[model samples]
Each structure stands twice: as C-alpha cells, then as structure tokens.
Target: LPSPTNGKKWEKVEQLSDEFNGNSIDTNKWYDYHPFWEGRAPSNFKKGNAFVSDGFLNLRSTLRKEPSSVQDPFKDIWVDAAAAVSKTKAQPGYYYEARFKASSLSMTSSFWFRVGQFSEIDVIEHIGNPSKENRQDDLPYQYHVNTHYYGKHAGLQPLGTEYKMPGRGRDNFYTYGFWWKSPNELLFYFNGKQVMRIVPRVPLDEELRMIFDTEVFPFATAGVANIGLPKPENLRDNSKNTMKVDWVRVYKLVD
Candidate 1:
C-alpha cells in the first residue's frame, strides 16, 4: 500500500493481477504449466493439477497410484506438480507481490520470474516440511531468495541465503514482495519489510514472465528413499499437498 523506493506510486498492471475469485483461471493471462520446463524428475508438471477454487489458485501435487502412461526424459515417476505462468512479461521498475500458503508436504511453493534460460529471479521458494538438518538453506521457516544466470559469469553462480521468518512457512499464509528496481539492484520483502537485496553480477536485460508454481525438489538422504518427495499417504491427503494463492498483484512505478 505504501510507495516504492523511487518515491513513485505503484500503478496496477491489471493483466498480471488476479484474485482467483472466479471458478477458473484466466487463460488469456496464464498458462497452467511451464511451456518449456516439464519439471524435476519423479514429479512432472501436470495441467490438471492446477485449479481455481474457493477464492484461491490451487496448485496441487498428487501421488500416482499407477506409473505415468507417458514417459519423459526424467522417467519413472509417481508424482505431479503444478505451475502457472503469466502470459505477460515484466521488466525492471516493476513490483510483484503475492499472498500464498505453502503445501504441508516437502514440496515447494514459489513466486518468481524468468526470461527463457538466460536469467531467473527466485523471489521466494519455500519448502513446507524440510527434514535435512544442518542445511539452513532448506528449512521450514526459510525463504530461499536467489538469482540464476546459468552458464554465465564464468559459471560462478552464488546461491542466495535463507531468510528465516517469525513462523514456519507452512503454518500459514505469507505476503512476499519483489522489486526489480533495475539491471543491477533487486529487493525482496515479506509482510512489508525489506529482507534481501541483490546486485547482480550479470546484466539482466530481458523481460521476464511471472510464475506461481509448486515443485518437488530432489532431496535425498542416504538409506532413506525419496526423502523430499511427498510420501504416498501425505500426497493423498488434500489438506497437505496444495499450494493456495489468495491473490497476486503487479505494480509499475508511475512517473
């Protein structure tokens, strides 16, 4: 509700804004799955997994009782995740915010941006039930905010740090905000407080599409099978495996 750093008021970019009050997603503005990335192994992106219901954009993960009829390069799967991408692209000077709740399983709930394979701004990535101890980056209450420019900057990419919130991520909904201020500077916030700032090593010059997606990360613990993938029992329980979005709002600095 307050003005941004440049002292300019935020003007709504209606095309990328959605409250999910209706019974279906606005197809003109979003695609139910990532057009290019099928998703990580053991969990492929499935369109039917994403839906709008009860005032929320629900991206659900499911455990397959039977193997997938189709096989991807990352074959042999038993789970499906959901992704929704904005058809419109966003550039610097834009502010993106979303109110979302994470899935209770070990899957991820994210709000972020990308421009093909050139650059990615991982605004917020929350894993609801992390079990890997001593790895602070992947925790229940952490927001892993990072940047990626794959195969660039001499292949030296720095993964950003974990932002610990007052409560565990899956416990409730949290408002995440991102400000792509310029080619060099970026800002991240939660519940209206500035948390992380990044000065990119590479020039992020392309327009990026917005995405609200859930992913099953490949986290493994030796002697324990698929520790990060949802357990069959947990996946079947709808209460534990759905990422729900209350709303997403995009704003541009009005000069």
Candidate 2:
C-alpha cells in the first residue's frame, strides 16, 4: 500500500538541447530508435523529411511506406520505436521530459517516458483517430500516466485512467514532462500543469528506458483489406494522416 506523490516533485528540469543539433546526448545517454529511421530492408526511412528544424524534433508522418522505391506522395504512414532512453548511458536516476504536438491527421501518436525494471511513465499515449473503430471507448486523445512492476506485483499493478486531451488542441503547443526518481515515485505534467502520478515499490535506482514516437491504427481503418468487421472506405483515410513533435527534453535533479 503506497501513496501517490510520496516523493514526487512539481518542479521541471530545465531543457538543454532544444534544437537536438550537436547530438547533445552521448550514444549511451539515450538511444533514439524509430522504425522509420532504424528499420532494416527496404523500409529504411526517408531522411530529409524526418529530422530537427525550427527548434523542434520532427517525427513527421509522410505519404510513404516501406521500400523507398515505392513512395506514395499522399498515403498515410507511421513510425514505431521500442528503444526508450536507457540508463545504460545517462544517469541512472533522474527526470525525463518532452513537449509534443499530435498531428491533426485525425490519428494518434504517443509520447511516452519509460525505464527498465520498474513501471513506465507515459506522458501522452494517443491512438490518433477519434472515430469509434480506433478507440475502445469514448476516450481517444487521452493521458495514461502510471507505473507497473512484474513478478509478484504482476496482476496487482495499478493502471492509470484515460483523461481527455488537456486542451481542445493543446496538441498544437503544449509541454509534457515526467519526473522519474524511482522508489520516490513518478509524476506527469502538461504545459506546466500537473496531470498524473504513479508510485511503485521498486527502488528509485533501477535503470530505466524511454521512447518518444508516433504511430497509426492501420487496421482501425484499413478495413476489408484485412480481417474482422467490414470498414467503410470513408471511415478511414478520409483525410490527411500525420503527427508532429515540437521537441523532447530530458533532465536530471542536481544535488
């Protein structure tokens, strides 16, 4: 029986490399892996279109899919990555944060922070399209901030509830952050506004990983082309598809 915010802090870690230029982070500090950029075979991403510019990291969606040779200038595409930042390179126990804007593409992209061993801290986990098919319930663009441990604590873990998008389109310009100090607890915020919290028994010193990425519900709209219930062509791909990220910042608490 642990209480939320047991050792949580409301302060934000100042941002360092807002431009993501000099590769401020050592290869080990944090590993950025996006399927769009790290995919093997013909799916290797189309560089120029996905990078940093104008003070923000562009995790943009394009009208293309696997195999650069078969580029579609108008089709919707997505990027997924599992390499959440690891303590393997950076400080073992610190705070991680980022600010992002979901694409108006009518689909969802997720911006989350996680570490290994202990439970993860998800800042913004969106499913893109608000249409009935893509969402399991009335909540689509929602916030899921919580933690979970495996083994003995497996089924006993507490799950975070889904909250509507903070602001109508806060997606346009809002900052989200995570305070991960372990055993202490984890906290989440939006535009400087505290939003969610999660506390776990796991020691705060455990190494953790994190990730910031964008994805789509291809099956939610791809329809008869796949399996299950029939989908109307208009129900899916009815408009442009995409997600935008302004920038993501990570920090540590100084003694």
Candidate 3:
C-alpha cells in the first residue's frame, strides 16, 4: 500500500472507499455524528455508537444516555462517543487509508481530517489504554500526527506527535496511512511504514471531512479534569469500548 511517491500512480477512490462490509454507516458515505461537535467531556456522540459488525467499522463508546443530536455546543453535554463523517471531501492529493482497531477504552481512538471547524488532519489519535501513561511497539504501533488551524484560520492549534502501539492498541488491526503530500507535505503512515512527517504550520487547503470518532478528554490531563474518563466499569464493558474499522481507502493520484 505504499506505492505512490515520486512516480505516483493510484486511482481507486470509489468516492472514498470502504469495506465496512455493510449493515450500516453508508448513509451514502457517512455523517452519523459530529456535524459539528457535542462530544468531548464525559463522552457523548452516540448514533447508537456507529455500528457495522463482524467485518468491522464499529466506532463505539458507552456509559449510555443519548440526547444531543447536534446544537449542543457543550450544553448539557453527555452522550458517549461515536462519529462517522466522511461524505467524500478529502481532496488535496488524496491517499488516505484505514484499518483501525483502537478502543481498549481510555477513550480517544480517532482518525481525523476536518475542515468546517477550520481544518484538521490528525490521521489516527489513539488512546487505547492510556489512562495517562507516557507510553510502545507493534501490531503496527504508534499513533498520532497532526495539523489544525482554527478561528481566523491562521494555522497551528492542536500540534501533534506520538506514534507507538501494541497488542493492546485494542489487540490488533492497525494501518493508518496518509499522504496529503501537498498542503504542507503531510505524509504519515503506520502499518505501511513512514512513521511521521508533518509540515503544516498552517496549510491544509481545506476539502477535508473524514472522521471516525470517540471522545472524552475535554482537556486538563495531569492536572486532572477528566483525565481520560472511561470508567462506568469501562463504559460498561461495551467490548472494551469498541472502535474497529477493518477497512477504508482512497487514492486519487494518477498519471
């Protein structure tokens, strides 16, 4: 899956590939949540926590109590986490990929790229089992590579770096590739190698969109505001908080 570099040549992008193997999440290519934001903080973004099944594409989280279907903006705020977002919008030299599996429940497990909130591109944000440790190695380990620019669109807001994994990154499946390659040369891959290489101090020319979420972490770590909240007996053990995926692909760099 590494092919396209200097000699470029990959074109499959069935409007942003999938393999969620049916049974949901194809609302014509996603958007089950985060049409804006109502998650993060005691976790809550439940579209029944996005499901698909055995073949993957799970994306869940629980402690259950739905309510905010958008327009919350942090109001009562209390759902559980789950997102979908994709509806085809990641242009800029394409080449995204997925095959996730992180959700042992410390709540995070993201794989991002957005624009409405002013641009983002954090191919995989993992937290599987990080109740706040410093964190290690393989089943395609490591996770996180970022970019963001908000508000007036100036550039740099969430800054990122951290790539390492395990049999505990939810016990397997891991392939987070990326290759926006243009808007500031962002190229980050994991199971496909190329660990991290970011250069966006503010360039990610838009057209973003893609998601796959999970929340809880409204901030304040060592100082401990929510410090990675998951406990409700680990979200009632919803299969270790779910966040599966199994497939996702996109290429678009012909010639």
Candidate 4:
C-alpha cells in the first residue's frame, strides 16, 4: 500500500459513507440518476438496483421486464443501472476515496467527480468484461483513470490513464482515490499507491461532486476502449451484477 506523498495533514471534508445497515439507500446523501449523463437513457437508471443491505451499498445492473417505450434515435433498450451521487459539492484541493468491489464484466462501475457543464475527474472506472475463463491465466483485468477538462475543451480529449488489475487483486476490495490540487495537479491512487499524475494541468476552477454508478449502454451503441462488449443474450439470460461499495471519504490538505 502507498502513503500520501504530499507532506500535509489531511482533514476530513465530506463523506458519503454507509455500512448498509438500513433497508434503503440514504436519499439525504444521494439520489438515483433520472437521465444518467454517461449513459443518458432514463431506462438505465433504476432505483431498484441502488439498494443497501448487510453492510454494503450495492449498485447493480439487471434486466428490465420490457423494452423502454421512450423513443430514441438510437434504439429501444431494456436494462437498469444504478448510481449514487452526492448532494453537496467539493471544491478543488480535496482528496477523494472509495472502497469497493467491482461487478462482473458485463457492465461498468465508476468513481468520478463532475462539475458544471463538463469539468470532470474519473478516479476509477472498472469495465467488468473479463470472464472467469480468462482469469485462469495471470492476465490482469482492465480499468481506467482519467481527468477531463470538458468544460474548457470542446471534444473528447482528456488525459486518459489505463491500468490492468493484477489477478490476485481482482476478487478483493480495493480503494481508488485521487488528490486534486489547485493549478493542475491531479494524482491518482490505487490501494494507497500512486499510479499516475497529470501535469500541464487542465485547471479545475468549479465546484465538483462525487458519484458512484453502475451503467450499461445499448449493446449496439456501446463502444469503450479496453472494455469488452456485453452480449444481449447473455445479459438477458442473467442480468444480475453488482458494484459493492464499502465506503466513500473526502479529505483536504492541512498544515
């Protein structure tokens, strides 16, 4: 495990943590995405999949009973995704962390920060596409860590970092984090180890909030680098996968 490199005492700022002692999700802290921006289909965000139980916050993806009636130019799809987003915002220089176990390779689990328009930071995104058969060897599971200056830039150009989770760490709980320092220092961390850093920084000057989400896109339209595409028949046959989160914490640098 890695330690904080910056020599500063950290102060807790905001935390959207739960031990899953309750029956339902804590609405006071988070809400389901109506039109989930990442996969902007309303059918993708289902309250039922975002539930709490037995000491864990579970964000799941499951099959929908019927195809979405909502007309879209793309296609009519039927699937539900889960997301947990904070009601408050975090300013720059805040350190954010989340401990969770990713779901299977049919969907995507993410720990991200979003501000107005497009300024965002993706601390970690696990696209669970590796099958059990593939893991028999020592091949690592693929995931990504990214920083976006969408609010300032025009297109899909952002600092993208990709990584492969070692076979031994695939089934365990791990903490993914980032420290956003002012004037363009974004440090990404996994299990306490510094994995990557972004310089020549896309300076973040807006308030950003944390989010946790499990999402599935329309099979035909879903195309992400380094992630395997999910099959419709397979998901239809068994559409139960979860992103189990232990806790989420936020901190700030202090002297």
Candidate 5:
C-alpha cells in the first residue's frame, strides 16, 4: 500500500483517543447511544454506567430491571447496560486501536466503527470469557472482527472472522485494532501484532464513527444468538459485568 496522502508523520489524533484519567466521562468527546430501541437491543444505554476511573474507562452492564419506555411489542421490561460513541467522525484509511479487557460470560464488550454509507467495522467483539461450567466443547475464548458492506441491497450481508487469544479474554488486557492500508484492505492487529488482513466485497469510502459498548441480549428477545453462547438469564445475577478499557488511539499512516 502507498503512504498516506498527507506525507506527514504518524500523529496521534487526540479527539479519537482517550486516556480515561478523568473523574467522569468526557461528555464533549463522547456520548451514549440511543436510550430506547424498539427491538433487538436488550437494554437501554445508561450514561451512568460509563465512567472513567483509575486510569481506565469502564463500560458496565449490571443486572437491574426497569420499566420499559421503548414501544417494543414483545417486551415490557428493560435491562441495565451501557454504550458510548465518539463525537469525532473518521474518514477511511486510518488506524484505530484500543486496549481493553472483556467482562464475564453474560454480555458482549465491543469496539466498532459505523460508517455513514453502510460500511461497518468490528474491531473487537468479545462475548465474555468462558468458564468451566459454561464452556462448550468446541467453542473457546475468542473475539470477532467483521466488515459489513451495503451495496445496492439492504446491509444484511457481512464478512467476519474470529480469533482465540492465548488465554481467557478476562485474564488480561489485549490491544485490538485495524489499519486501513488502503480502501480495498484492512490489517487486523492483536496486541500490536498483525494477525489478519480483511479484503471485503466493497471498499468503504465514507466517514465512520467509533463506538464502545457492553450489552446483554436477552434470550427471550434475541433467540439463537452467538454460537454456543449462554442466555443472559443463565449468567450469575449477583455479580457485576464490566468491560475495562485502558486507552483508545487513532493514527494516520505516515509516508
């Protein structure tokens, strides 16, 4: 791939990266996703669950019930969860990375990008760490990276891949990222190490917004979800579920 068009050195983009050292979330640079959704979202996003402390950003999903405000015909209750998106929008062909640890086996912690033109990139989507009692015979501790393109048709189609880290995802922090070497390709990285290349069906061109979320998709709402994943109800309710993020960084490739 050729160098970035600017011919400038790699510079860290501050608005797109976060150190999480503040006592609270940087509301100017980030905001929660929509609070109410009609379907598929098992919980309403809570700003209170997203906070910065101890040099880390914590996106938490706890077991709390509330009256449903969303007009979903199927469900009348809401669960507690959290999500946030970057206020800054990013164009194509940039490097985006985040260092984070997954929560327990109840919810999914994710860092992703959503483009205005229907292209979406999933940098990391960890569906909790497996435990001895809940672990499946074939499925292990793994996370997914995906690319979705909406061409002439609706954006139902997506190309995705998964990777298993050295240990359970909750054991330690891992850096997951993607470098758009060009419009046609993206290089996936794990802990600053290149792992895979994604050449999707369509090359993304529009600007994308970054997002980090921790959520629970109840089995009653989302039937037959992730492969071998246990239902949200089956998870221990007394414990707190969280996704801890040390930092997030973005860079433009240098010439």
Candidate 6:
C-alpha cells in the first residue's frame, strides 16, 4: 500500500540482496526462506536460486542432488530463509502494507512480514498449483491470509479461506493488500474485498519487518517426487518456467 501524505508513510525498499552482507542483524538485511513446505533448505541459499528481473522478483525452486547428510526435499525440515527488509526498524505499531502482482502459482509464495520477534501479517500466500490448498497436480490461483503473534503458542494462524483469483497459472496481475493494527489486529484484502481481519488481545507496538518469499512445499501427505528434473524433466529447465511480480510497495501509519 502506497502512502499518500498524512495517511500511511510507505517507502520503496529493496526486497532481495545480491550480497548476504554478514550474519543476521549486524548489517546483512534480508533473510530468505520459510517452512511453507516440508524441506530443509541449505544456509548457502543465494540469488542464483531465484532473482529479480523486469521490476518484478522471480522465485524458482530447482531440483538437485541431495547429499547423504542432507534431508529429503519431501521430508526435509523447514528452513527460515524467509527474506527480510526494513525502514531502520518496525515503526512501533504502524500500518505495514505491500502491493504487488503475483505470477502463476508454482508453490507457496507470500508477501507477509515481521520485525525481529514482534508479530506477523501475511498479505497473500499461494500454496496450491491452482490457488487451492493441498492440490499439487492442479495450478494455483488462490490467496491465503494469515497472522502470527508473539508469545507462547504463537505461530502462523490463518485469517480466512483460500479464495480463487482471476487467471489460472498464466500471466495475470491483480492487487493484494494487508492492514496491520497495533497489538494484534490484522485485515487482508483482495481488490478491497475485506477477506479477513483479527483483533488481538494486546496491541503490537514493535518494529514491522517485511518479507517476500516463495518455496515448493509438499502437503502433509503429498510428495516432492514430482519435483526435480530426472523425474519431472520439464521442471529442470528454468528458462521455460517463470514467476513474475509487478511491483512491491509498503506503507506505514501516520503518527
């Protein structure tokens, strides 16, 4: 969400980085990967895995040989590679927002974010091939709204059902919105439909961190055997497949 003058004060920040900088916090901003699926991605993850082009960022999962010590993509542990970018810090209980067009669903792609260990608000997330939940064979064209607060029993909690958007797995552009209120109030919108909202028991007045990530995840009983080249030859060629994003903009509430 772009801020107008006195309403929301949003900024245009770089989402991904070509360099890792250092470790988390010091100066190396932007952490990538999250366990949206069932794989333990390596710490050596890089832009070579996925990158930005044509104003839109591209996220692509590749099939490679897993080391004997490496976990299986199907049963691999969830990795915290989810990238992060911030405006110095979370603005202390501000309205954080991002607007972008999601390409065809290849796996779980999201525009949700968090700062340090405050709270989380997922603007939109794609899990299914055709936008439905747990349907791998099908393409993804739906969006999932979610939120997670800080404290015991704090984790990703869904805000609403996965709704189907226009366009199949092809190239189409639409608006995605998210509203985060202090403590624990969250609202998700698909073209301003008011998909979901949750009011928290306590107001979250921490830093707001934003992230944009994508991964190929296997549902509870699903399998990643369909991934990789030797098995799914078509998936090996990255040039043939693509996930495009139009633009990502964030907004903060006015003081």
By lDDT, the best candidate is 1
Q: List the candidates' TM-scores in order.
A: 0.88, 0.59, 0.32, 0.79, 0.80, 0.63
Cα lDDT of all candidates, in order?
0.77, 0.44, 0.72, 0.64, 0.67, 0.46
User: For model 4, how does the per-residue alpha-carbon lDDT over 79-189 read when each residue is reduced to its tens digit?
Assistant: 677877777776777777788887764557778877466577777767655433443343235547776655446565667666667642236688887777664777778
Q: Order candidates by lDDT, high to low.
A: 1, 3, 5, 4, 6, 2
Error (Å) of candidate 3 at residue 179 is 8.0
Ranked by TM-score from best down, the candidates are 1, 5, 4, 6, 2, 3
**Per-residue lDDT tens digits of candidate 6, residues 1-255?**
423445555544334222222222323433333323223342222343445454555555444443344466444432222232433444444444444444333445566666446466666665424323345443356566655555553653433445566654334556676655545566666765666666654555566666666544443212122322112232354552344445454455444
Backbone clashes, candidate 4: 3
Summarize candidate 5's per-residue lDDT along 59-148 as a digit string, tens digits. 876544433344551244355666778888875777888898877654667888773566878787676643334444323367578877
Error of 2 at 169 (Å): 4.6
How many backbone clashes can be found in candidate 1? 0
lDDT of 3 by residue, 1-255 (tens): 667767868888887888888776678878788777776655668775777777888887776554344354233455468988888788888888898778886667888877455777778767776554443222124575777677777544566676665455677787888988798788887778887887877767778788888777745541113334445566667778788989899888787
C-alpha displacement of 84 in model 6, angstroms?
5.8
Q: Backbone collision count in every prediction?
A: 0, 15, 9, 3, 0, 23
- Which parts of model 6 are misplaced by more than 4 Å? 1-44, 66-71, 76-88, 91-106, 128-139, 149-151, 154-161, 221-234, 239-241
- What residue pairs clash in candidate 1, if any at all? none
The C-alpha RMSD in Å for every predicted model, in order, reads 4.0, 7.8, 16.6, 4.3, 4.5, 6.8
Highest TM-score: give the candidate number.
1
Q: In model 6, which range of ten residues has the least summed lDDT?
A: 221-230
Better of 3 and 4 by TM-score: 4
lDDT per residue for candidate 2 within 1-255, as digits (tens), equals 112244643332333324345433334333445422453221223444344545545554444434233453123232322222333422334555566655443334456544344445455655444444534333344565555565445555544544566453323556666666455666677666666776655544555445555443433321101112112231233132334455566565433
